[PDB]
Symmetry: C2
């Protein structure tokens, strides 16, 4: 009846978020390219919550028109939450990057996120109980060597979302906007970012959250009054906080 839209639902944080919210009886619109994985997730959602309605959207969100079309197709649904989670990364020096991939990364991590945020805001700003959650990274607040382009995309996500969140608050909007900033999380991110499958976090990363743990944090952020949900890089504690960037409003 009321729906949560999750982009990048087919694996990782998005997948676990779907499973967690199914635990709360929510209906879901699950968006990704991998139809097969979406269908697997759907089965798992329905096992957790038989009365959850699930809508699958097999869509490449790296195309701006595809994003517009996606949103237009939801017009007959009551969306209470929209989660802009689809995204990927890259490891390489700038002088070494493949522009096809980096261009796509800009279209996905920045453009698709801006298009859906904008369209959601346009027709949810005055609707009670609505929430926009954009997924940045701790890398959207502090730069990581060998990941400059990706970090920059997340600085965009962080600044955009903090700006939007404060615009809505100050303008008396009913819509709330939030930003999740994970650190290391065990998903397919490293595999896609290095361009080779089967990275093992247990044998390569000293500190990381599971995707299930990150989904829990995401849920805590939604239910909170805080704008920012960020993992501390030193302690790996999850912190609900106010905007981190300077704001001239």
């Amino acid at each position: 009846m009321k729906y949560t839209v999750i982009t990048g639902a087919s694996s990782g944080i998005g997948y676990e978020t779907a499973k967690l919210l199914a635990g709360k009886g929510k209906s879901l619109v699950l968006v990704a390219r991998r139809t097969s994985e979406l269908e697997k997730l759907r089965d798992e959602v329905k096992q957790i919550s038989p009365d959850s309605d699930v809508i699958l959207k097999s869509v490449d969100l790296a195309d701006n028109q595809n994003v517009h079309d996606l949103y237009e197709g939801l017009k007959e649904l009551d969306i209470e939450t929209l989660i802009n989670n689809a995204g990927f990364g890259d490891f390489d020096l700038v002088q070494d990057i493949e522009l096809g991939k980096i261009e796509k990364m800009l279209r996905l991590n920045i453009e698709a996120l801006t298009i859906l945020s904008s369209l959601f805001a346009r027709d949810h700003h005055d609707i009670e109980g609505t929430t926009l959650v954009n997924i940045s990274s701790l890398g959207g607040y502090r730069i990581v060597p060998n990941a400059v382009t990706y970090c920059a995309t997340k600085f965009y996500v962080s600044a955009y979302t903090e700006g939007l969140a404060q615009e809505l608050q100050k303008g008396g909007a009913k819509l709330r906007a939030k930003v999740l900033a994970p650190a290391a999380t065990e998903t397919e991110f490293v595999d896609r970012a290095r361009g080779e499958a089967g990275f093992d976090y247990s044998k390569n990363v000293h500190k990381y959250h599971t995707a299930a743990e990150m989904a829990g944090f995401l849920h805590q952020l939604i239910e909170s009054d805080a704008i920012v949900g960020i993992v501390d890089g030193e302690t790996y504690e999850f912190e609900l906080r106010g905007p981190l960037f300077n704001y001239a409003g």
Copy 2:
């Protein structure tokens, strides 16, 4: 024989930079859409410096292919400096924006700048005497109400450029990357951002630099060892300094 590439040369900061560097006897590649204004600038550059060679590129940089084709066409030139100055803004709430314009803004402010930075770095990283200068904004370090999307584009430019600059330094590169962050500057920026010609800074803005003053700052940043050239929002003093963002390298 050695060239400075200036994007957005047809008005504002870019225009004044061309005239200043002409004063230094430099040769120029001037890029923009307005052929007529490019030719006017060319006349003025030649009046300042008859021995400066001037190459004009009438190009819409909001199309990624056009940016690639632009760069490939300079292959026979010796580029010592590339300035990613083309860009525009918008004033409006997120819920009120026009997606065509904001989509274009992402393609120009973010994508064209990334493409040219990446391409320049690819074949200049080890070349003595080369400089990349990306034009951000004071709004790429502090968020301005009613300009959230644009500010996010400039947080991208700031983080990308600081990240790149540090990557190059840490890696022993000969190439130097810099970021200029103007505050209010008397250009066509307000006209294009409100979608309304004829804005008068003298009667509407308490503090602003002229485009000529900002060109001078730009020149000081190139000659400096500093990564960041930023205008103080309270004093409007120009400061040469190091990265502002948290960096983990």
